[PDB]
Amino acid sequence: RPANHRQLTFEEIAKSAKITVNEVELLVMKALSVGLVKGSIDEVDKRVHMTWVQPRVLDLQQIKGMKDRLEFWCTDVKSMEMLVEHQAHDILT
Amino acid sequence: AVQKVVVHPLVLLSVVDHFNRIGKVGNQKRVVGVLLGSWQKKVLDVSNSFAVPFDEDDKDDSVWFLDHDYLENMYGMFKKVNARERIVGWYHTGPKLHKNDIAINELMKRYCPNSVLVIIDVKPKDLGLPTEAYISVEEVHDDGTPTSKTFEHVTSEIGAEEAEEVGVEHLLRDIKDTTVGTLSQRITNQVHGLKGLNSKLLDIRSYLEKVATGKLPINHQIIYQLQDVFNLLPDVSLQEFVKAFYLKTNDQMVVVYLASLIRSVVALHNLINNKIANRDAEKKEG
Amino acid sequence: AVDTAEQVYISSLALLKMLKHGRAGVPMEVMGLMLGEFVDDYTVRVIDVFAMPQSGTGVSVEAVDPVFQAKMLDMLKQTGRPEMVVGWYHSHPGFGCWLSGVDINTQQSFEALSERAVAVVVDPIQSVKGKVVIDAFRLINANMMVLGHEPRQTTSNLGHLNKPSIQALIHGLNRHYYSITINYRKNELEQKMLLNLHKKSWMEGLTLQDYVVKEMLELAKNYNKAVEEEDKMTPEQLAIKNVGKQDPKRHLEEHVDVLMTSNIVQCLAAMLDTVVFK
Amino acid sequence: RLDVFEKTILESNDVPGMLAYSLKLCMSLMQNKQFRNKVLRVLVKIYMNLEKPDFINVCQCLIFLDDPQAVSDILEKLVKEDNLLMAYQICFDLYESASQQFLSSVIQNLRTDQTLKMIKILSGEMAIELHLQFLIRNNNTDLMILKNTKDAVRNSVCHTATVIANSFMHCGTTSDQFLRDNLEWLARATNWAKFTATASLGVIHKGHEKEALQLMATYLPKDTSPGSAYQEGGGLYALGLIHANHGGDIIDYLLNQLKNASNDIVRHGGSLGLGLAAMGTARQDVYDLLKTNLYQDDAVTGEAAGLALGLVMLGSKNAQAIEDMVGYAQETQHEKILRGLAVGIALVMYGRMEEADALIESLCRDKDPILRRSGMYTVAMAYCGSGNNKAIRRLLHVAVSDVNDDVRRAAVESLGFILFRTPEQCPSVVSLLSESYNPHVRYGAAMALGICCAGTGNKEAINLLEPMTNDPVNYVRQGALIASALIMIQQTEITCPKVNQFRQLYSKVINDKHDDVMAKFGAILAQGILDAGGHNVTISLQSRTGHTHMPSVVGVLVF
Amino acid sequence: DLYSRYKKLQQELEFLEVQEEYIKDEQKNLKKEFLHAQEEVKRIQSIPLVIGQFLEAVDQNTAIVGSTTGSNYYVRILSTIDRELLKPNASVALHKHSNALVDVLPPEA
Amino acid sequence: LEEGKAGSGLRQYYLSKIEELQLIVNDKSQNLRRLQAQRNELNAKVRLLREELQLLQEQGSYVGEVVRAMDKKKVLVKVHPEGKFVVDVDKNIDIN
Ligand SMILES: [Zn+2]
């Protein structure tokens, strides 16, 4: 996913990883030592928050999924960057 | 070993002035010479050098010769005037590297443990901080090839020195310096989107080309890995700033407040004092 | 007989080893040699400059090794251009770069070898970036005191070089010597990249790289407030009152315009939120 | 519109002169020359349709319409009308006004009594001798100040100063004085100083088209071959002065001395002598040997190749001329070839207001320091005689933003060439430039008031030049001496009180050894400028003729 | 005739109208050039410096300062601060060669 | 005239109104021309101190002590750590 959507609910981990609520601690905190995610866990609502990310390999749908959400950062920023160039070029000269 | 190099405009010109030397007589190839490095630390620096007659045949694409009588005795020349200056490697103007460049470095390793080659550019064009640098190592390969000798890119940066900016920085004379704080940072911003997002489009089109053709490079894996480090924030629709929304304007909190507070009293300094000194001269004269 | 004022065309490549080899001898004085071509009487060009061994015992006429040049000229033949030697130069970092007692003794020796043998001096200290500094001179013969002692025709290229006149001892050597005009034949091809290589390396390295928040403004507010009262007491000090105190005095600067630009730094740097992002 | 205008000029009664001075007023206030001459061409028709003939109207349309077929038919009727008195006005009016290109076209169709009378008017034969006899009468010689500058006994800069100073007051008298009195002092001169002895000889001898050949035979380069080679190189440039504009039999005299003896320093004075003689004639063979002189690669001869090429091609706008000149400017290694070529491409383009702007875009935009000076002398002559606001735009931009000080100088100097029609505007626009810290701009700022206001008697220019000679820089004082000497020409103490104040200052500073030799060169020269032609002759770019004065501008811009 | 001058008089009107952007563009450049001249005087002398002892203020724009070696030096003062930090007797930093008066101690070290 | 000499004055009034308006803008320029030339002279003042510093650049400038005065205009100079000196004229302030 593009997220964020960073913090995750325990029921989602209890769905995908199909683990009980009492064992989610050992699960996600062990990944903290492995190094795939550094995200601390929010234990009030029992929601597991994520930080950084671990990339692995790639797929043909990942490149197509890239061009969708990667170049989208290129077309959105440069579009409004021209607005910074347009209006503010007069005060510079 | 060699991490980064420092290329002075003086030694880079020693490649450029030799482009006038053999450029008028021609014919093929490029300008090639041996590089004199100054190594005080892991960071590499270059002060002077000496250009040597060199040619590389096409046919015969693997043929190259340095003149080593030029390399030996002229070393004792620069060594006699400068004891610190020694040969750290070689250079050339490229623009790219033919496969024959593997044999130029391995021959001169008798002079230096690792010879760093510097690809330069006599005509500035694109895309940015010019020239280039390579280091000679052996990574073999994962596929099982026989030991592969491939030059890895070394980041190049320009640097200055005392007494060398006398004539160099004089001749331009047309530059406005800078001005730091107003135009200096904002022109970069207009370019930071340009130069930032153009390589974004150039690579994303070549990364799409991967599936099409040119595979390998797979790469692997360096491409997507640091791209996913870029993915700490995407930022995609819409900006996912719900936590950074109130913090967005909260960083602009005091910046606007002070700008409101300074312009109020700066006016009180500008407006009052101007009116005072003006009417003192204006009405008392007539 | 006929002597016309000479114009020196220096190449951007020859300018390198003038300051560079001179920097290697700092503080002590070096002895170099000028390399170029003699076109005619009223113009001269130096197309190359090379480094010569520095003398730690002091500069002498024997510091130049004749087999050093004979091995160099042979290496210049296999090099693109084998041009004949012309003249000499020496650095003088420790002072205002004037011709010393050894420089005059090596004059009659070098002017016997080559016709002109222009004496060229250079100093690092006088400036850093925006001044030519350096120096140049040419011996006018003391035997000519019987003849007319005031060359050259086409005067003010000397006369203007005779400005500032550079104190006393320097122009005190205008007896038996006359300086020479240094102009730059256009290298602008290289000089255009000289500006591009310098400014691009100085523009954020990618232009991207570079592009204490409220606290820097809490430190700035001390300059934007606590400095105000020491600034705004002066108009109450301008009130005498009235008037026993010596006037006028203008305290308006420089804090007012500094705090102006101080906001110009903080406003456009805060625009990085709106600029970079979207 | 020109329809109702025909009814306004045809209105009854008079209106005796209202059509006469309106052409003088409209010429000043008209921004676009497009329909200007269209108004003039229909006006000169109603003059002839009117009963009373008026010959001051045909004087104005002759130069502006520049129609060789129309100027041929007006005098062809005067030949049939047989009265030489009424045509005698347009006879010499066509002479002093029309340039050399228009004179060569009108002389051919007209000569095809009254036929012998038109020969000396266009060739200026009788016009020289009548003013040759004027000089010797009104000329009043004063040797006091000349001797007061002679006794300084300075080994250099003196040989050039006195021989150019006496030539001022001695114009056209042809007499020999400073040559006969001291033989040894002229022998003390050497290098290019003896070049002036045979040169200034042609100054005093300017005019007098007959004896100019056999009198100078002692300086012939081919036969004599003096020890110093620069003495024989000024004989070719000497007669070019006399032969400025109209030529003569000496065209063969220059042809005999170009192929013998001195080379290539013959081409120096030879091309300037042949180029100034062919100036305005649009000759061909002179352009042929000027191209090979452009390729001689020598720096000193490059000035003679460029300067003589703009002369001969002035008003013709040769395409291949500049193409060979500006095409050689990139790969040439010398500045002096770039200088003669700077004025060379500048001298050819004059008074167009449009065509020349195509080259102006290339000149100033280029990074060559001398070629940027070329754009200013090119934009000056192109805009000469107009107050156009498009030229002042880039004129200040190169005079300020450009780093080179010499081009800022030549930039503010272009204001005196263009604005001489209304000299009152120069003291206002060049005022703020007088406070520039660099004296290079002040040298041209003082000249801008010197060349433009020279004819005027304006005292404000004298006031602005008062602090200019007080400035610590030496050559800005010298530039103030020549400029303040141009404002006082023909004007005595009764005109402005500053006359005697400046006259005593010129001899003062030159007799003071503590003052710089540089500035005091223009001191005695400022005297001569005030004494030029024995105070008899002035220099005026604005006259009833309306044309610019080519030799004074070309001479002062080289000076 | 009155419409004639009526067509004459707007020339210097418009001629001074373009003289508005004449100065305004010129003075702001020179202003930035004067601000660039502020970096000049602040650049001099940079480093290094030598300590010296101030003796007395003789007149404007210059004052005498005793060197650390004991030899009193007469030096042109810097055009920035001529008064408050001068003081009758104080230790003021001087340049190596020029011995230029720039800044005194707080006081003091 | 009626077009006319009554209307043309109003036409001439517009120009004279703008001429006075321009004179007001010119009066705003004239006093502003002084703020330029002032700072332009101040731009020469920073260069005046630069040029004057070059006179004081080499050795600096010293302070002497005159033990005796001579009518020949040569004045003896003495520095406290150094030895006594003497120099030719040297005339700036009145000799008295
Ligand atoms: Zn020495």
Q: Cβ separation of F36 and D432 shorter than 8 Å?
A: yes
- D367, D398 in Cβ contact below 8 A? no
Q: Do D29 and E26 touch (CB under 8 A)?
A: no
Q: Which of A57, A70, A77 sits opposite B204 (nearest CB)?
A: A70
Q: Which residues of B touch C211 (CB under 8 A)?
A: 185, 188-189, 192
Do chains C and D meet with 3 or more Cβ pairs nearer than 8 Å?
A: yes
Nearest CA to B49 among B37, B36, B58, B60? B36
CB contact (8 A) between residue D156 and residue C148? yes
Residues belonging to chain F with any Cβ–Cβ distance to chain E shorter than 8 Å:
5, 8-9, 11-12, 15, 18-19, 22, 25-26, 29, 32-33, 35-36, 39-40, 42-43, 45-47, 49-50, 52-53, 56-63, 79-82
Count Cβ atoms within 10 A of the Cβ of residue F91 and give its class: 0-12 exposed, 13-18 middle, 19 or more buried. exposed
Which chains form contacts with chain A, at 3 or more CB pairs under 8 Å? Answer: B, C
Q: How far is the CA of C127 from the centre of ligand 1 (A)?
A: 21
Q: Which of D424, D428, D441 has the most E C-beta neighbours within 10 Å, making it the best mutation to test the interface with E?
A: D428
Tokens of B115: 């010879």
- Residue C173 CB contacts under 8 Å (≥ 6 apart), including other chains: C98, C99, C137
From the list B190, B194, B234, the residue facing A73 with the nearest CB is B234
d(CA D132, CA D130): 5
Backbone angles phi, psi at B238, to 5 degrees: -115, 105
How far apart, in whole angstroms, are the C-alpha atoms of residue E13 and residue A66? 64
Give the phi and the psi of residue C21 in degrees, each rounded to 5: -65, -30
Method: cryo-EM
- CB contact, 8 Å: F38 with chain D? no
Q: What is the DSSP letter of C83?
A: P
Alpha carbons within 13 angstroms on the beta-carbon side of residue B169 total 18
Question: Which residues in chain E have their CB less than 8 angstroms from residue F49's CB?
Answer: 41, 76, 78-79
C82 neighbors C95 (Cβ within 8 angstroms): no
The tokens of D166 are what?
């006496």
Cβ–Cβ of A84/C277 closer than 8 Å? no
Between the CA of C121 and the centroid of ligand 1 the distance, in Å, is 9
CA distance B258 to C220: 9
For residue D159, give every residue at least 6 positions away whose Cβ sits within 8 Å of its Cβ, in sequence order, or none: D186, D188, D189, D193, D196
The one-character DSSP state at D512 is -
To the nearest whole angstrom, how far is the Cα of B213 from the nearest Cα of chain A? Answer: 13
Do E90 and F75 touch, CB atoms closer than 8 A?
no
Angle, helix D158-169 to helix D194-204, in steps of 10 degrees: 0
List of chains touching E (3+ CB pairs within 8 A): D, F
Long-range contact pairs involving D264-267 (C-beta distance under 8 Å, separation at least 24)? D264/D293, D264/D296, D264/D298, D264/D301, D265/D229, D265/D230, D265/D233, D265/D300, D265/D301, D266/D221, D266/D232, D266/D233, D266/D236, D267/D293, D267/D296, D267/D301, D267/D304, D267/D305
Tokens of residue D516, six digits: 């710089």
**Are A73 and B193 a contacting pair at CB < 8 A?**
no
Resolution (Å) of this entry: 5.8
Structure tokens at B203: 């690579």
Instruction: Please state, in angstroms and rounded to a whole number, the distance separating the CA atoms of residues D480 and D468.
Output: 6
Of B204, B228, B240, the CB nearest to A71: B204
Cβ E103 vs Cβ E95: under 8 Å: no
C72–B20 C-beta distance less than 8 A: no
- Using an 8 Å CB-CB cutoff, list chain B residues near A84: 189-190, 193
Chain D nearest-CA residue for F47: D437
Own/partner contacts of C232-235, CB < 8 Å, gap of 24 or more, are C232/B265, C232/B268, C232/B269, C235/B272, C235/B273, C235/B276
Contact E37 F47 (CB under 8 A): yes
On chain C, the residues whose CB falls within 8 A of the CB of B53 are: 78-80
C103 annotated to bind ligand: yes
C40 labelled binding-site residue:
no
Burial class (CB within 10 angstroms; exposed 0-12, middle 13-18, buried 19+) of C278 = middle
Question: What is the distance in A from the centroid of ligand 1 to the CA of C98?
Answer: 9
Q: Identify which of B78, B259, B270 has the shortest CB distance to residue C263.
A: B259
For chain C, report the end-to-end CA distance as a whole number of angstroms.
76
Alpha helices in chain B (DSSP H): 9-25, 68-81, 102-108, 165-172, 183-212, 222-229, 245-285
Substitution target from D400, D431, D434, D437 for chain F, most F beta carbons within 10 A? D437
> Whole-angstrom Cα distance, residue B265 to residue B270?
8
Asked if D437 lies within 8 A of F33 by C-beta distance, the reply is no
**Cα–Cα dist D196/D228, whole Å:** 13
8 A C-beta contact, residue D249 and residue D210: no
| Residue length of chain E | 109
Distance from CA of A48 to the nearest CA of B (A): 16
CB contact under 8 A, D396 and E23: no
**Interface contact F44, partner D, CB < 8 A:** yes
DSSP-assigned states of every residue in B174-190: ------TTTHHHHHHHH
Q: Are D520 and D510 in contact (CB under 8 A)?
A: yes
Give D387's contacts in chain E (Cβ within 8 Å): 11, 15
The shortest C-alpha distance from F79 to chain D (Å) reads 33
* Lookup result for tokens 């004298």: D462
* Residue B82, φ and ψ in degrees, nearest 5: -130, 115
Residue in chain C closest to D521 (alpha carbons) equals: C155
Count other Cβ atoms within 10 Å, centred on residue B96: 7
Sheet holding B4-7, edge to edge: B149-153, B134-138, B116-119, B86-92, B32-39, B44-51, B4-7, B155-158
**Residues 6 or more apart whose Cβ sits within 8 Å of residue F24:** none
Burial of B27 (0-12, 13-18, 19+ CB in 10 A): exposed
Spatial distance between the Cα atoms of F16 and E87, rounded to a whole number of angstroms: 59
- Beta carbons within 8 Å of B223's beta carbon, 6+ residues apart: A58, B207, B217
**F3 — contact with chain C (CB < 8 Å)?**
no
3-state secondary structure of C150: coil
Looking at CA atoms only, how far is residue B47 from chain C in angstroms? 9
User: D435 in contact with F at a CB cutoff of 8 Å?
Assistant: yes
CB pairs under 8 A between B and C: 227
User: Does E touch D (3+ CB pairs < 8 Å)?
Assistant: yes
Residues D20, D57 contacting (CB under 8 angstroms): yes
Helix axes D265-277, D235-242, angle to 10 degrees: 10
The DSSP secondary-structure symbol of E104 reads B
A81 interaction partners in chain C (CB closer than 8 Å): 275
